């Protein structure tokens, strides 16, 4: 017999399935003998100590900045002073160097939130002695010569001696649940084009510059013995907190600046000597 | 001080922190590039986006998209020098004709090429097409569907594929030179027509050998106003 | 996993020879040295066979076997005085061949497996190196009859870098010394051949 098929349904045809998404469904055709066969990760697989998320990379300690602390530095003097924004290192000049893991990875997202961790390693010996005060300052900033303004905020005083390192969690205290990135979402300028106001007027967005600052001031002046160095370097490490968050994938603000060469056809393009 | 509470889940449940999830969303490679039937076909080397495909102001003009190096997943792949598993290539032919456009997979042969190429420098390939040599092939029929998504396997000798080198144009040991790819994907038309190509990681895909962040530069500040005019 | 497939014949260990401590060349750190400067670097195993400690009994099995898998352990001993100060970092980069000149800063070192040495306290540091290579085995030695298509004797690179410059007191010493020591925790050899001189 050849009976008629009365079953039918209305459909909406799409060219690709799950094209925008990173997960869900896919209509990909395997270029294999067996269409459901996959790569084996029985022996060769990802090592357990490797980072699985962007947040895992942000939890790696990275050397942000350095500063010197000497016996000549009078009390109340700013040894360190920066806007701590993981979006951009500077708002008013170009950057070139080794950016920290958490800054690199934060540069891929339009939004960030949660506390930021700092670690101050004093490159000294047992004969160095002194005290500094680390301060997290929000909304309103302190004068360079007014130590009292810094003391009125969220502070941690460290007595340098036998211990040569101190940890500092910078609280997240803002008017919004997340902060948008100060870097651009999309920048088509590739050939260092000389900027004008019309270029800026037709930008992707407006840079919401942070006024949140972390400072280090002298409490007790450094008083080392005559036999050792009078000045020491302090290494400032940075990473995302345990509840550091990222969202809204965008164009990367940072890109390789060293040993960048585009691929060519091997061996057609003059490889045969 | 307090660790506080995470913002993850507050705005939405669409988490975008997973490395695999970032690598599985597509990257444009070629934007409206020509296919010519005088050649064997347009070669696409099977490798993820990275610093290997980064444009530098001044260097010779390629067919590649300039902003591949600035994509999230390219920045991620610059941290991992090993990758294993399948990649997925979304190819769109700019046509509505009934001519079939064939996409042939070549396994790891040891070379590394891209763009239009005459294999063994002949001047005729209609009688000896690459898609009818024996290799695995799939056809696009633009009248039906101008797009396709094909998943290429990890057909190589090595445990891992090498993501990048310090210099991509350096003439070193020839067997090692080809270990940055796991094969090729060759598109062959009937008549002259344009195409666009995207790439992403497959479901069966892993990265390893973490290298940490490289030396970088930015000038994003300069092309934007602040919130105080 | 890959060991049993890659080699049809069984692999061999020589713990008595390979799993002993062996010192290599001395490293000099001066006050002139800046942050990010390479004090020393080692392509392994190559440099432990044919440059450093060439007459070591650790190197004897490499003469006869063509392939192997290698897990190492490297101890570093510093000797600066209590009136000096400074920081040195030692890190490992797996499968570094034609990628030594990138991701090669102090920041990359802090990301990868590493150890940190304070030059005043003289704390010892021990970095553990597993075998992470894109092939099943690494080749031990080059030869005239052997192919030049595969560059042998390099599955990883070790970097010794200045993190914070050496400083000293008035009329103090302008330098101090660090000594590395190496040993194989797991050296499996494969593919027996006639004995040859190393490089």
């Amino acid at each position: 017999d050849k009976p008629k098929d009365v079953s039918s349904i209305t459909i909406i045809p799409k060219p690709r399935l799950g094209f925008p998404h990173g997960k869900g469904k896919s209509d990909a055709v395997a270029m294999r003998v067996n269409p459901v066969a996959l790569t084996s990760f029985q022996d060769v697989s990802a090592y357990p100590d490797e980072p699985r998320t962007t947040l895992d990379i942000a939890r790696i300690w990275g050397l942000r900045s350095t500063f010197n602390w000497g016996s000549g530095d009078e009390h109340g003097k700013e040894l360190f002073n920066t806007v701590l924004d993981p979006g951009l290192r500077f708002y008013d000049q170009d950057y070139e160097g080794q950016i920290t893991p958490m800054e690199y990875v934060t540069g891929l997202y339009n939004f960030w939130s949660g506390p930021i961790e700092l670690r101050f390693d004093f490159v000294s010996n047992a004969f160095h002695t002194g005290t500094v005060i680390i301060s997290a300052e929000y909304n309103r900033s302190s004068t360079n010569t007014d130590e009292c303004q810094s003391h009125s905020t969220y502070t941690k005083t460290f007595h340098l001696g036998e211990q040569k390192s101190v940890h500092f969690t910078v609280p997240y205290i803002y008017d919004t649940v997340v902060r948008r990135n100060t870097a651009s979402a999309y920048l088509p300028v590739t050939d260092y084009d000389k900027v004008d106001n019309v270029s800026r007027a037709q930008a992707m967005g407006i840079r919401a510059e942070s006024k949140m600052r972390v400072k280090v001031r002298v409490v007790n002046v450094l008083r080392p013995v005559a036999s050792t160095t009078s000045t020491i370097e302090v290494l400032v490490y940075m990473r995302g907190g345990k509840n550091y968050a990222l969202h809204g994938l965008k164009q990367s603000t940072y890109w390789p600046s060293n040993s960048v060469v585009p691929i060519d056809s091997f061996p057609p393009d003059g490889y045969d000597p | 001080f307090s660790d506080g509470v995470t913002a993850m889940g507050f705005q939405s449940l669409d988490t975008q922190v997973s490395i695999k999830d970032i690598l599985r969303r597509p990257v444009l490679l070629f934007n409206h590039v020509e296919l010519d039937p005088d050649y064997t076909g347009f070669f696409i080397p099977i490798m993820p986006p990275s610093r290997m495909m980064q444009y530098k102001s001044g260097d010779k003009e390629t067919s590649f998209q300039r902003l591949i190096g600035r994509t999230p997943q390219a920045a991620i792949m610059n941290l991992f020098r090993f990758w294993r598993g399948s990649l997925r290539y979304t190819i769109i032919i700019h046509s509505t004709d009934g001519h079939p456009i064939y996409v042939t997979h070549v396994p790891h042969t040891g070379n590394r090429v891209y763009g239009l190429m005459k294999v063994n420098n002949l001047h005729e390939y209609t009688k000896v097409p690459i898609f009818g040599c024996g290799l695995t092939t799939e056809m696009i029929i633009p009248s039906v569907n101008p797009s396709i998504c094909v998943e290429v396997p990890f057909d190589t000798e090595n445990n891992w594929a090498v993501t990048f080198d310090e210099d991509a144009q350096r003439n070193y040991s020839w067997r090692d030179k080809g270990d940055t790819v796991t094969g090729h994907l060759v598109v062959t038309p009937v008549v002259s027509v344009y195409m666009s190509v995207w790439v992403e990681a497959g479901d069966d895909f892993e990265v390893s050998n973490f290298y940490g962040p490289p030396s970088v530069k930015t000038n994003d500040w300069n092309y934007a106003f602040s919130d105080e005019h | 996993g890959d060991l049993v497939i890659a080699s049809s014949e069984p692999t061999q260990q020589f713990r008595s020879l390979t799993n002993r401590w062996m010192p290599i060349n001395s490293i000099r750190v001066t006050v002139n040295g800046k942050r990010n400067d390479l004090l020393a670097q080692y392509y392994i195993p190559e440099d432990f066979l044919s440059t450093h400690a060439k007459c070591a009994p650790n190197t004897i099995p490499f003469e006869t076997y063509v392939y192997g898998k290698y897990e190492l352990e490297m101890k570093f001993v510093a000797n600066g005085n209590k009136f000096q100060c400074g920081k040195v970092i030692i890190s490992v980069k797996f499968d570094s061949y034609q990628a030594d000149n990138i991701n090669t800063g102090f920041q990359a070192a802090l990301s990868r497996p590493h150890i940190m040495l304070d030059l005043s306290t003289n704390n010892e540091g021990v970095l553990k190196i597993p075998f992470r290579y894109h092939r099943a085995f690494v080749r031990n030695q080059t030869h005239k009859t052997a192919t030049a298509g595969v560059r042998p004797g390099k599955f990883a690179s070790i970097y010794v870098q200045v993190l914070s410059p050496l400083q000293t007191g008035e009329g103090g010493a302008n330098d101090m010394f660090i000594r590395p020591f190496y040993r194989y925790t797991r050296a499996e050899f494969a593919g027996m051949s006639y004995k040859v001189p190393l490089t």
């Binding site: - | 144009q169 350096r170 003439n171 070193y172 | 990010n36 390479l38 004090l39 440059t51 030594d100 560059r151």
Partner: peptide, 24 residues
């Protein structure tokens, strides 16, 4: 014309020498 490095800083295999520390 950068197809290979100069002979001062290289080990036969046309790569940076382990002796040449100033590469960084």
């Amino acid at each position: 014309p950068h197809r290979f490095l100069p002979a001062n800083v290289s080990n036969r295999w046309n790569e940076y020498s382990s002796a040449y520390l100033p590469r960084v």
